[PDB]
């Protein structure tokens, strides 16, 4: 019979009058039905979280939460085929992606923040005063309260646990709404929380959509303590306006239009391997993927020729096969949007070096949401498809001649999430990568994520940083305790 | 023959079609005419800021900006009497306040952030990979761009430099708008920037109001790169909505309804000395002042007797007298708001232990904005005057019996700026202070501000922390550079 | 039919031409035969260590060593009863000590340094230069090489793993020599290293003595890369002289004559509970124990009455009974030294408030190394038994009148390991504890050890600090890599 | 009349029965006479330091010491021609060296440690206990006591203030013994301390030699609190044995036999500029200079040809002339030692590519201690002049073929002070520099000293690190204050 993905509030599974289907983009089938949460249940979740902070969870030590985070990760690992299966059904992710990136990084988030919490120090200074007095200043970290987590469909488990792990490390309760397209791993995560014994109310799961549904409810609730959100920058704007009511802290990661910069002195074979991922991993649906590619003129033709052949060899096929490298897009609706941008490219005059259409398989997969890996060329830096985030398996490639030129062009965007630079020149690597106006600037690699380091986006691509202590300070209330130490009295 | 406070944009002093008066609350007289920036001038300032980053200022090293910050501080110090005179005229502050708190701390903000900048490290980790490869991760700090700074009237110079100093340390340009009530020290700050040679467009000053004036224009400008604001929380809400269009970073410090907790084992004399300041410094118009005072029952009557006697001795008088301890409120409008809260207290049934009215001098000061230091008692934790920020020289005082009780009652607010706890008991001091839901929790002191420590407000009282590296991180764009180091091929 | 404790060198168990007995101080009987390493075997161990760094261990990442440390900890935990039995037999420790302190803390050292390693950052600064150039500075941490570890008998497993865990975290090989009195848990540690697959030569174990034995051979080896030692300060002197030939890094923790300071406002019951441990835990053979106790005069008589009554209830008995609180001393020789100090006290005129002799059981335990918990009083701060470390279950107790007095008297020693201060007064607690000239200054507790914090001794009590990053820095070679980044040419 | 360089003890200038001459190596003249301190006066200095800690200095706040350090630096700057003059007379340093390195870095030491002290935080952790208790741990920094400073002749002011500035930052008193060859700037530093008002006993200056004189006295004194020493590693061994008596903390920087590694892909012109300094700055008398130079085979001949011409252009002349680049060695005795090594090189079979002798000027300079900048070649890695520290203006240059080879050869020494690597290859720069077994590994530069970073030597080249907080923690006694916070009692 057909899987139910239910809500999880205050330790209880909760079904709904209103439901909706979970469709797999592999072939357009239904793989589960999902129970939507009304304004009332979200209210129930927020109140259950605040009540949890009045119980066992509110009395946990940091050390106990370290252990909880590790028990969560261990149970996820024990159930990792379950997580893998659900993630692949919801998204169409190839096994090569889900089993090496999504599920392992999703588990590692909990282990990494357990380590960070275990060693987190106390921020402290001593203030000298006159007359031999002094003050000791030390920052006490408390939970914010109940953190609202609105999670995207492109990396469902990974970006969910990227928020949930530090939020729980800091002793918060969470109210989590996964994307309507990707409810599965979030529901399995709730099963894990229940299995290891996380107190009820600590982890709450509400399903639905954004506008006029669970996401809007969370963002508007006056008793939410913070809102974390990854996704469309325009939706970030909407969430921030709702957070304005109670001046709620917000932490945003908001997509982008990221540049790759390839110099003639690069290690060409490593660069091609890396750029095939930066362009087409997850069918180009990573917020960090490149969609603007600048290639130094003397290797531009070689690049285009070799990249077109590499694309021909890219296996776009059954996602469950171990050597498939690209699956469908997330949904028919997103496919429609990406194909509309393929058409805009045509209209703007683009040359198609690869792709530009839809694979035909001759079976049920043709009712799924597939698109070809695509490369365009020939346009100015001002064309719409060169500037506007497409979020599909596509880039525009253009030659450049000088370092000063390519920095200016790379930074000519209102976004600023990520960049990837390829050169073997020592000084140029460091010079160029640091001048990229982005949160993460990779050199001779792409999508290497050190969870201890600051990560986020500039401009329209985000607000704030997470990673390491940047996460622990965001999901914490800091109270500077300032204790005056008096001289002994007569 | 009337002082003019002009705008300062891209290195030029700019007069305006719209003007308004700066009035002193000492006697209601006019101190200066202020030139209100229009939207075009604010646009010009933002554009001048971005242009400055393409020039000399955008090429500065950290060490050069360390020197700039110190040069700014030195010139301010050379001109400290001018800053003092302007601050006192705009605000009514007593000499005892302005010459020990506002001007010294305002200068110190620049020197402190110079030190912090000089020693700021690079945040860095090594990531090990398979195959003997590894990646070096290091965070490069760059300016955000043009930081909009909207400054309050209660500590005009101090809170302005609290933002401007770290913003400049990080290499930003700024567009600053001081309160319409207190334009003076900000205009003098612009003079200092010009005098020490800060490049044009790095420091821009636009005068005016909030709505349909310079405050809104800065808030909404699509090319502002961050907004930092101190003042009323609901204005914070509005600014945040404006910032949402471009998901601009915001840093907010937004007042509160702060608790004092006085245990019977406190050092009574030190506590009274500190509490007179926590209640009445700056006429209760420090955002960190206590307006809810919880006193352990065994010393409640003693506290009330001693506090009333101390208030009778508090010198509410000519602010220029070195003796004076309280001046007027900032403005007639704010005085009206505070007296309306005094009257709301009388309607809610309060007992007045001190004050509740207006001093009468029998001279022109009676045209100013004066109010008595006031202590009320006898009300519920639920009464409006006990929960709503008044921002005047008033507290409601009430007894408590247990530690767990007073922690609950202290934390029973939607605010969370500050607390001050008085006890000589070691474990109680640490246990209670840490459980305050506030940004700053003082024990046996009040309003001691270590510029290296995290400072900010919880709940309605703010967003983010500043101080030390918390400031340099907020006013900087962080780019994590991640360099894969391949094994030899 | 007799247990053998062998050497473990380059992955092989090695027996020896020279052997000695491990005796239990409970009843003087033989627990095991120990195989003493000769100079050739120590040389082989050092060479095996350097060879290991050219192999698998030298290729490990930090994350792999994090996992190794945790695997070591897990296997120790699986075998915790064996470690317990061996530690208790070698030492006479009561179950109440060994099962709550020695074995749990010994396992925790590995897990703690695994955490610290996992999150260790890279120390880094940017240096700005003229001409738009700059330099990136980042410190690369590498192993030192082969760390010699010479371990004491009072906490054999705990202090061994305190050194071995950070040394391995940093990628070193080790050559360890446990005390000749307490070879057991170190030999079991070698079994754990072998069982979890630590590469051969990474962990080497050599048994024996100091002079003309393995301790000296390690100390003097020209290819040792660092020496870490805990024990008698004058042995520290000798080791340091040996290390001088190759200017080898040394890290030392060297005992002391630690002060306790008890103010009249202390929580009397908590203080007595803590002080019974600070005096008599491990029969006073923790290097951190108090042997000088200063008690504020108004509670001196109460302290002495209550302390004597508590000592009468202290169970000095079969160590395997879950009830027992004190076992024998480590050895007959150490017992002889402590009783000679008891007699020196009687010659210096001391009043004995408790103890001063030897318990009599009327069975084989009388052949062991037992001593009574002992409290003396009535002497000058200058008497020999008041200044010289006894390292047994004894303190001299004396009244004081003022805070400045007791700070002076507490600090009147050439040692400086630890202090324990008892007071409920907030300012006094912080003021007095910070002025102790010691590595660790406890307030209202004793022997609480946060493995992330700096720990060590001042004066004769040590050199350096360990704990947290202080350990990873000591057991690592730091190479500051300084990379000039030129403007484009 | 002739300058007197007196002792400075407890605020008083102190002369001596026993004196000795300060000879300038420019022409062998006398430029001052120096008053030697006996065991008694050193005892007086140590006791005056401990007494100073019982007075005003012992009550200074960190903030006050920040200001003192800056007042010292400002007075040094005001008197910088005085410092320059004394340093150049004692050493023969060219103006180009003393006015750009010695005096400016000597002053900057005080300003840099003032900044580090001003922002130094408190190391702190929170320990959770059972039953809702916890402990606050915070490290309190106190002075060690009286720090003994034994300072070398090669960088007299710079290495003196490198120790004195952090020692005073940490609130210690100091007893300072400058090299018998270089008493001047140390005596001027005492004048500065007196001028700005440093309390008497805080800064004490004793003159003399090492064995059976002031240096040995300081190192043996039972009441010295720490010993800092830069110089000959064998003397470090002697000092460490004397420190063993009271297990005194020691911080050592002990010379070396440093390698330069030059790859064929280097920026050749920048490398030559940098290597001329690494070889011949201060006439090769910097502990950090290169004496073993490995050049990748394809550029070995070009390197030798160009370097020989550059040496010909190196101005070895009157040190007071603004474009002189090399002065004499420090003394006739050191000159004798360096020339003995030139002779050992001859005997070992070396080819001399440049120098190898003594300049002849035809005037009084010929009674000074001059030697030619020298380059040898042709020897094995095992020859004595290739392995033994010469500490003069000389290197041995040899070709290499592979990266693995040159790392092994560079690290084949019992020293490990410094290295300098020249390449434009990104990955190779980072790979090779990090594997150097040294305290400081420079890439495409040499002798760039960030005073916030850890600095020291490996192996025979030192013990410990200094720079930044590494200095502040060495010259401080750390007391971890651990405060148990109990639950409220019934």
Note the main attributes of this structure:
homotetramer, 490 residues, alpha/beta, 2 domains, six-stranded mixed beta sheet, globular, 2-aminomuconic 6-semialdehyde dehydrogenase (chains A, D), Ald_DH/histidinol_DH (chains A, D), aminomuconate-semialdehyde dehydrogenase activity (chains A, D), Ald_DH_CS_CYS (chains A, D), aromatic hydrocarbons catabolism (chains A, D)
Task: Walk me through the structure.
4 copies of one chain form a homotetramer. Chain A folds into 2 domains: 1-255 and 451-490, no CATH class; 256-450, no CATH class. The first copy, chain A, is built from 15 helices and 21 strands. In chain A, strands 15-16-17-14-13-18-19 form a 7-stranded mixed sheet, sandwiched between helices. A 6-stranded mixed sheet of chain A has the order 10-9-8-11-12-20, sandwiched between helices. The first copy, chain A, has a 3-stranded mixed sheet with strand order 1-5-4, with no helix packed on it. Chain A has helices at residues 39-52, 62-78, 80-91, 95-119, 156-169, 184-196, 214-220, 233-244, 268-280, 297-312, 332-347, 384-387, 403-411, 426-435, 468-474; strands at 4-5, 7-9, 12-14, 19-23, 30-35, 124-128, 134-143, 146-150, 173-177, 203-205, 226-230, 250-253, 258-262, 290-296, 351-354, 374-377, 394-400, 418-422, 440-443, 462-463, 476-485. With 490 residues, chain A is of the alpha/beta class. Chain A is globular, with a radius of gyration of 24 Å. Chains in contact: A-B, A-C, A-D, B-C, B-D, C-D. The interface between A and B is large, with 69 and 69 residues. Chains A, D: It catalyses: 2-aminomuconate 6-semialdehyde + NAD(+) + H2O = (2Z,4E)-2-aminomuconate + NADH + 2 H(+). Chains A, D: InterPro entries: Ald_DH/histidinol_DH, Ald_DH_C, Ald_DH_CS_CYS, Ald_DH_CS_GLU, Ald_DH_N, Aldehyde_DH_dom, OHmuconic_semiald_DH. Chains A, D: The active site is at 253, 287.
